[PDB]
From TrEMBL, chain A:
GO terms for cellular component: cytosol. Residues 198-210 have a biased composition (Basic and acidic residues). The keyword Ligase does not apply. This is tRNA (guanine-N(1)-)-methyltransferase. It catalyses: guanosine(37) in tRNA + S-adenosyl-L-methionine = N(1)-methylguanosine(37) in tRNA + S-adenosyl-L-homocysteine + H(+). It holds the Pfam family tRNA_m1G_MT. Homodimer. GO terms for molecular function: tRNA (guanine(37)-N1)-methyltransferase activity. The gene is trmD. It comes from Mycobacteroides abscessus (strain ATCC 19977 / DSM 44196 / CCUG 20993 / CIP 104536 / JCM 13569 / NCTC 13031 / TMC 1543 / L948). Keywords: Cytoplasm, Methyltransferase, S-adenosyl-L-methionine, Transferase, tRNA processing. Adenine binds at residues 134-135, 137, 139. S-adenosyl-L-methionine binds at residues 84, 110, 133-139.
Length: 212, 199
């Protein structure tokens, strides 16, 4: 049973998540994903969420006072506060597994140059905070990271949603002049397993030598 | 100028003038899946439907992108490389993935890239497509160390001060401080980027 709150200035971007949630899991009370517009917590008529960076430089920084109020309302001491950032610790499958048993994730999605660092630093004095990155590329903000994190985590919650895997095949046995490897149709399941292991080994060497 | 075509059995998921993005329902070219030859859990997407779809959508100049957890890593260098392409087609799998012959056949007439966006497991290629699209599009013409922390007003908030150097107006001191924060962060969080063992 997990609650996920996502805070973002683009709530419509989190649409694919609510599109991916089965009725059975929601109705059984296994999962609830709520998305919140950060501007609900702005102080001014212009609904300002950003301001110039101290020390200069390009772009804008998200205001701590707005985020502070949002997190004050949404988080409790039991919350796991997840902050996507390109400077984060790596989000991996081990992370997803660890987080899959949490009662409450709050995902704070930044835009512009990111969120004033005091927001996470203050939050970390009263709850668990995790700054993470989903990979070594640059996005426009945290929303796409949130989509990935939510999917990777929730698919590990029963009933909610190393070597590389080698090639897979299904019908038809011959297609555009390419036959399924005969070993797969041999009924020699020890040989099939060894063939698959070697395919996995080869693929890992070629594509992900960093894993060996 | 870039065209992106995304092919998926879950077009509803993809809802998020120099670039156009089109989403196509794979089922338009039809059951898209069956049990794997050789056994194993789950289902594999049949090559037949994919072949018909890609025949219609792709040309020889197409870069066919296939998200897969067994792919080569998609990185910022990849994003730069793809940013000058005229035409990306992203083939999103579901179930246990797409029959390998789809990529193999396509590779006889266009360039094919099997890639992974990270070391975690998704339910299909759609979220990976959204990530790839976002990372690439922000680099399209006309559109080392980890980033350090950023701060903005007020200079004191909840009794926490913006680091005083950032208020000093000393560009050299600020540059040095920011480099140091980035160094600390990279060593702590991503030591592999500086050629050290991972935790
Ligand atoms: C200062 N920089 C410069 C470039 C653009 C940055 C935009 N941005 C603002 C908030 C924010 C959050 C996450 C991510 C992100 N990028 N790549 C990943 N793997 C991430 C993850 N998790 C990116 C983000 C800000
Ligand atoms: C249990 N099985 C195991 C294999 C994958 C199955 C789901 N699936 C089907 C098609 C497909 C495409 C990409 C991804 C994916 N996962 N993680 C990443 N970095 C990806 C990327 N790019 C996952 C996918 C689920």
């Amino acid at each position: 049973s997990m609650k996920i709150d996502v805070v973002t200035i683009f709530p419509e971007y989190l649409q694919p998540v609510r599109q991916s949630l089965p009725g059975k899991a929601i109705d059984a009370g296994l999962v609830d994903v709520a998305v919140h517009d950060l501007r609900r917590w702005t102080h001014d008529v212009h609904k300002s969420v950003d301001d110039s960076p101290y020390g200069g430089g390009p772009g804008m920084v998200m205001k701590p006072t707005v985020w502070g109020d949002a997190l004050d309302e949404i988080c409790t001491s039991e919350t796991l506060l997840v902050v996507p950032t390109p400077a984060g610790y790596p989000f991996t499958q081990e992370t997803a597994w660890q987080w899959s048993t949490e009662d409450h994730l709050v995902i704070a999605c930044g835009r512009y140059e990111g969120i004033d660092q005091r927001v996470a630093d203050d939050a970390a004095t009263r709850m668990r905070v995790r700054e993470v990155s989903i990979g070594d590329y640059v996005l426009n903000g945290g929303e796409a990271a949130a989509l990935v994190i939510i999917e990777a985590v929730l698919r590990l919650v029963p009933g909610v949603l190393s070597l590389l895997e080698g090639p897979s095949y299904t019908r038809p046995p011959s297609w555009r002049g390419m036959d399924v490897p005969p070993v797969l149709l041999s009924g020699d399941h020890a040989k099939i397993a060894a063939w698959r292991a070697e395919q996995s080994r080869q693929r890992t060497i070629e594509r992900r030598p960093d894993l060996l």
